[PDB]
Amino acid sequence: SAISNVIDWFNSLLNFQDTTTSNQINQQNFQIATLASGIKKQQWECRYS
Amino acid sequence: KLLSDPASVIGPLAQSMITGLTGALGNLNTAINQIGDVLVGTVVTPIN
Numbered sequence: 001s002a003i004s005n006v007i008d009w010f011n012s013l014l015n016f017q018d019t020t021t022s023n024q025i026n027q028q029n030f031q032i033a034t035l036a037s038g039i040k041k042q043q044w045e046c047r048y049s
Numbered sequence: 050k051l052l053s054d055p056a057s058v059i060g061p062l063a064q065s066m067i068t069g070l071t072g073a074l075g076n077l078n079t080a081i082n083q084i085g086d087v088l089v090g091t092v093v094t095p096i097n
Binding site: 004009 | 081089
């Protein structure tokens with residue numbers, strides 16, 4: 001039972017590890033995309049975006 | 050023979066005959082079980 005519990009805890013830790021890494025990558029990419037895009041000049045202010 | 054090689058003359062004997070052997074084995078097994086249990090919860094009094 002002790003080894004089985006250790007197996008379960010290690011699997012849970014690996015799941016948390018991958019979820020946290022994916023969340024970090026997604027958050028950083030989302031912030032970079034938001035910074036890259038955003039407000040653009042309207043048609044009357046200037047011709048180009 | 051009993052002085053030199055006590056294997057053939059003396060038959061198998063229970064672990065409980067040895068002083069503290071069962072205590073040490075129980076302590077080690079309980080330590081392993083506590084190590085397994087703490088990782089999943091079930092707060093228990095630490096052995097050492």
